[PDB]
Amino acid sequence: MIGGCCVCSDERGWAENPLVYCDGHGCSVAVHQACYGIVQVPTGPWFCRKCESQERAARVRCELCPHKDGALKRTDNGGWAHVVCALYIPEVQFANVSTMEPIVLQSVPHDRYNKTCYICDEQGRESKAATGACMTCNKHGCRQAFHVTCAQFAGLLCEEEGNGADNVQYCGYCKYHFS
């Protein structure tokens, strides 16, 4: 459902950071090596964590949103979560930043699970809107809440420069406040 990398959306690959495609039957995951923590890109077929696991897509959903495709990693509680959800929800952590797994939920505040996604809700999807965790519009003062994956397809996500050598602040904005 996304063309290039499904984590950062960039469509260009790079010599030491290539686009890697999952050969998983029924899987259309494509990610940069550096966007999924791939240790060594194989000289043949490669499989995303989900397609390597021992259960069918029916049960393998993200704990943090209602969207089904995209690049998943295992969580603390032996669940699953989008890499992009983990990036753009501030309190989500990674146990190992090199391999980018597992995704650590345990420090996610209760206040991220008691919101309704406005994008979902304007679509009239009241069950989906309450599912998972929401990020908050990065505009000062605005308290609009939305799934990371919903803002991704609405084109509402962005990587802004942060204080530090190469610190990225992964954030988003509601339709009112983008740039």
Binding site: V7, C8, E16, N17, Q33, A34, C35, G37, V83, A86, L87, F94, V97, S98, M100, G162, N163, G164, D166, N167, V168, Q169, Y170
Partner: peptide, 9 residues
């Protein structure tokens, strides 16, 4: 090459 995760604030 630093991953997206390693760059997160």
């Amino acid at each position: 090459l630093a991953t997206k995760a390693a760059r997160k604030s």
